[PDB]
Subunit: 114 residues, 3 copies
């Protein structure tokens, strides 16, 4: 999978090893090889949640399979947990959009996964 | 819903109260509680529309329901109107991708909306 | 269509005219007037691919139609080729999410394409 997090939290508050932790945790959560996992963190964003600019985050998780009711609940617990612990963002100020991608709609290495 | 606007307009040109206005207007437009609305503005982007670097914007609106033919036309009029008035972006240089998300695919507060 | 590229490569490494090149190349690849094509490049991002922060990119291509198995493979060869040549990013460190949008879900000029 690939995970993206956009947040108003400042870059200086993103701890060393954050991308690495996300990569490993997502590998364990989806059972996928970490070598194909991509993570992207975007701090210092101009955003609001409920009209308030206290710390918040807007994220997305794309995956070819491994997306579903129970799985997404598990991913949300894991990811909100990491955002609260590492970036001090309250879980109720985090949204995560989940996308189950068809292999044919994911390009990589001059081709697709189809 | 959550609304994201990516634009080449510089940060200094984003007026005070913009995020607040988007939050209130989207709440009114969708009938959703403002406490749930998330807004994200990304200025100073390197982008082109029709090959031209004049002011433009690429946006997205995700919502669990309240997405449809007539509704999307109304949101586009509302949002393009705000971008034109506040950021001075011509409506024909704005694209807005609409997504009707399944509740199970939207994470929040350690779980999902399902 | 609209093409977005998020990458960790330096802004200084993005060639002048890259946005125009992407615009013209995509116009040819889709047989669409360049006037409709939007391109967005985001450099200097904090990201990792396979746990490594060597050059990589996360992209998306949204189009109303013209999305499919064979077409996406073609777009991937074209886009990875440009990223490798212009941004020096290895094709195997690039992901491109393809989206076939319904006209009703694409806002533009105060309305939608429906
Ligand atoms: C996790 S193994 N990501 C690798 C495949 C993928 C899935 C969705 C989007 C991009 C790449
Ligand atoms: C508007 S009420 N947003 C709150 C629920 C939501 C819907 C789609 C994506 C993220 C969050
Ligand atoms: C290519 S012709 N872009 C113009 C229509 C479009 C399609 C998808 C998303 C935004 C705009
Ligand atoms: Cl599941
Ligand atoms: Cl469950
Ligand atoms: Cl898909
Ligand atoms: Cl409708
Ligand atoms: Cl209508
Ligand atoms: Cl969905
Ligand atoms: Cl329920
Ligand atoms: Cl095809
Ligand atoms: Cl769609
Ligand atoms: Na899907
Ligand atoms: Na949908
Ligand atoms: Na689609």
């Amino acid at each position: 999978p690939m995970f993206i997090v956009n947040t108003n939290v400042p870059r200086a508050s993103v701890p060393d090893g954050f991308l690495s932790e996300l990569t490993q945790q997502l590998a364990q959560a989806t059972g996928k090889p970490p070598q194909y996992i991509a993570v992207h963190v975007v701090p210092d964003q101009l955003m609001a949640f409920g009209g308030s600019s206290e710390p918040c985050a807007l994220c997305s998780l794309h995956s070819i399979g491994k997306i579903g009711g129970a799985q997404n609940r598990s991913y949300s617990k894991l990811l909100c947990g990491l955002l609260a612990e590492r970036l001090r963002i309250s879980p109720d100020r985090v949204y995560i959009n989940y996308y189950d991608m068809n292999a044919a709609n994911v390009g990589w290495n001059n081709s697709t996964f189809a």
